C-alpha cells in the first residue's frame, strides 16, 4: 500500500503545516500537524475541557462505530516549547491520503495548554518519530507509520514541505518526480527516539563551506532551524543590523535587509536554504524588526533541522531495520 496527502501552511509565515487525517467510521476529518519530532497521535476531542477548545475540529469517539476505549491507558506530553497536552486513549481506524491503519491509538485530549487552544488551525498532532517516545502508559503505543510499515510497498515516508505553498507527505514510496538530482542518504541514530543525524557542515551565502559535524534532528514539528551559537553568529554577522535580542528571544534583523542563503551539508551533498526562507516577519504587527529563521540551539540541548531547513529539501524518512535519512534538492 501507499498513501499521499497534501500538507498546507497554517499561516503566511509557514509557522506549521496541517494535513487532513480521517479518523473513525464514518470518517471524522481533522487537520493534524505531522511531527517527526514526537511519537503521539493526539487530537482535540469531545473530551477536551470546553474552555480549552476555540475553533478546532474535534474527534467524538462516541460517533465512531470503530472506536474502542483502550482501557486504563493515559497519555501526557510536553513539547520543547513548553506546551503540553494529556488525556485518555481510544483505538480507531485512521487514514492518511488513502493509507488506512486499523487499531491505531488515537490519544484524546482532556487538557491542552494555552498555545494549542489559541491555534484554531491545528486539531492535533500525528507523531512520526520512533515509537519508543510514545507517552501512552502503561502500554506504550505505536505511531501511525510503525503500524502502517509492514503494509507499505517500501518502509518509508517522505516530507516535501512548501515555501509559502502546500507540499506533500507520501507513505510507502519515493516520488522520483518530486526532486532534482539524486537523494543523498545519511546515517540515523535512534538512541534518543528521534531522526537524529549528523550534518557535514555549512556555508553562509556565497561563502566557503565549513566542514564540521553538526548532530541534530529532522523535526517537521519545529518551525525554525536551531544550530550551535557559533554557526548562528556567523550567519547573522552577514546581515547588517542583525542582533540577538534577549527581550525578543533570539536574533532579529531589520525588515529592510536582504538575507543571505544558508547551506547545510548532507554527506558530500549540499542543501541551500534561500535567504527568503529565513525571514519570519515583524516581531509584532507594524514593527520594522523582523524575526530570524535561524536561531541558537544553545538553550535546547540539541540542534534542530526544523521546517526552515526541511522545506528546502525533499526528505526521505527511511524506516528500514536500520533507519536512514535522505535529502535531495527540489
Swiss-Prot record:
Keywords: Aspartyl protease, Disulfide bond, Hydrolase, Protease, Signal, Zymogen. It catalyses: Hydrolysis of proteins with specificity similar to that of pepsin A, prefers hydrophobic residues at P1 and P1', but does not cleave 14-Ala-|-Leu-15 in the B chain of insulin or Z-Glu-Tyr. Clots milk. Its EC number is 3.4.23.22. The keyword Signal applies. GO terms for biological process: proteolysis. Disulfide bonds join 255-290. The active site is at 35, 199. Residues 17-328 form the Peptidase A1 domain. One of its GO terms (molecular function) is aspartic-type endopeptidase activity. Belongs to the peptidase A1 family. This is Endothiapepsin. It comes from Cryphonectria parasitica. The chain holds residues 90 to 419 of 419 of the full protein.
Amino acid at each position: 500500500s501507499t498513501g499521499s496527502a497534501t500538507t498546507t501552511p497554517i499561516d503566511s509565515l509557514d509557522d506549521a503545516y496541517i494535513t487532513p487525517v480521517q479518523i473513525g467510521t464514518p470518517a471524522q476529518t481533522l487537520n493534524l500537524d505531522f511531527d517527526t519530532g514526537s511519537s503521539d497521535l493526539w487530537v482535540f476531542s469531545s473530551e477536551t475541557t470546553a474552555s480549552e477548545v476555540d475553533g478546532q475540529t474535534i474527534y467524538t469517539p462516541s460517533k465512531s462505530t470503530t472506536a474502542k476505549l483502550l482501557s486504563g491507558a493515559t497519555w501526557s506530553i510536553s513539547y520543547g516549547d513548553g506546551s503540553s497536552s494529556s488525556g485518555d486513549v481510544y483505538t480507531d481506524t485512521v487514514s492518511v491520503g488513502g493509507l488506512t491503519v486499523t487499531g491505531q491509538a488515537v490519544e484524546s485530549a482532556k487538557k491542552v495548554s494555552s498555545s494549542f487552544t489559541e491555534d484554531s488551525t491545528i486539531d492535533g498532532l500525528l507523531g512520526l518519530a520512533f515509537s519508543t517516545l510514545n507517552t501512552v502508559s502503561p502500554t506504550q503505543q505505536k505511531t501511525f507509520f510503525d503500524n502502517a510499515k509492514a503494509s507499505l510497498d517500501s518502509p518509508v515516508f517522505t516530507a516535501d514541505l512548501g515555501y509559502h505553498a502546500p507540499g506533500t507527505y507520501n507513505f510507502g514510496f519515493i516520488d522520483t518526480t518530486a526532486y532534482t538530482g539524486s537523494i543523498t542518504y545519511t546515517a540515523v541514530s535512534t538512541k534518543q527516539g528521534f531522526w537524529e543525524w549528523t550534518s557535514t557542515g555549512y556555508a553562509v551565502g556565497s561563502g566557503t563551506f565549513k566542514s564540521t559535524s553538526i548532530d541534530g534532528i529532522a523535526d517537521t514539528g519545529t518551525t525554525l532551524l536551531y544550530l550551535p551559537a557559533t554557526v548562528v553568529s556567523a550567519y547573522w554577522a552577514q546581515v547588517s543590523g542583525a542582533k540577538s535580542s534577549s527581550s525578543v528571544g533570539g536574533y532579529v534583523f531589520p525588515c529592510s535587509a536582504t538575507l543571505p542563503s544558508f547551506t547545510f551539508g548532507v554527506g558530500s551533498a549540499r542543501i541551500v536554504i534561500p535567504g527568503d526562507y529565513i525571514d519570519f516577519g515583524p516581531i509584532s504587527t507594524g514593527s520594522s524588526s523582523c524575526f530570524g529563521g535561524i536561531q541558537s540551539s544553545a538553550g535546547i540541548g540539541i540542534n534542530i533541522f526544523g521546517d526552515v531547513a526541511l522545506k528546502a529539501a525533499f526528505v526521505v524518512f527511511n524506516g528500514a531495520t536500520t533507519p536512514t535519512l535522505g535529502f535531495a534538492s527540489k
